[PDB]
């Protein structure tokens, strides 16, 4: 629960083809919010899932999403799914019962995502 | 870890339109393996996910799948996804990195599923 229990505040889980957008989000989150692109050995307080068409195809990404929710948002963890470049129809059905940020929101969804991260951080010692 | 820590050995998580098949599996599992159709207040050792086209659409089903894996198969729990009436292409990408039973297997996938349940049960006190 300690704000320093993790070395990063938020990391972005993005597919290979979405590299640029991921970085744009990291910059946005920086500007304090410490952020990076999620690595395997990566461990932060919040994990933003850059869910794009590419992310949904890559079987490893999906598995990552699944494990990112394995132990996550149930009030215990912080996982923020950002939906970009996808008709709301293509959206993963399970999202109708979970928190997520629509890319059509203000600042391509970035603002609401930062706010989401920001909120969780405060609940920390 | 006690075989009696749960009242049922296995319950089947099936969509509304797959009611019949679900029951067929329950009968198969019975014939000792205690089994039922998963309810909300349902709690068993193993949970078989009857993943069919219908199950994948129903947003509640997907959420159920997600939560059925939230705390599950990582060596700790027992969740068995059975894929029926779906071209392997439609299969949830995350499955390429997880255990599952193909409906094209012997006994419409039922045999391998019973074996899966059976195996987990023995690892119990």
Author numbering:
A (entry chain A), B (entry chain A): 79 to 109, 128 to 221
What's in the article?
The most interesting single nucleotide polymorphism (SNP) is S180L in Mal. To further understand the molecular mechanism underlying these associations in the Mal-TIR mutants D96N and S180L, we determined the crystal structures of these mutants. These structures showed that neither mutation interferes with the overall structure of the TIR domain. This hydrophobic patch may play a role in interactions of other binding partners because the S180L mutant is capable of binding normally with MyD88-TIR and TLR4-TIR.
Mal, which is also identified as the TIR domain-containing adaptor protein (TIRAP), is essential for the TLR4 and TLR2 signaling pathways. The C-terminus (residues 80–221) of Mal, referred to as Mal-TIR, is the TIR domain and is required for interactions with TLR4, TLR2 and MyD88. The overall structure of Mal-TIR consists of a central five-stranded parallel sheet (βA-βE) surrounded by four helices (αA, αC-αE) on both sides.
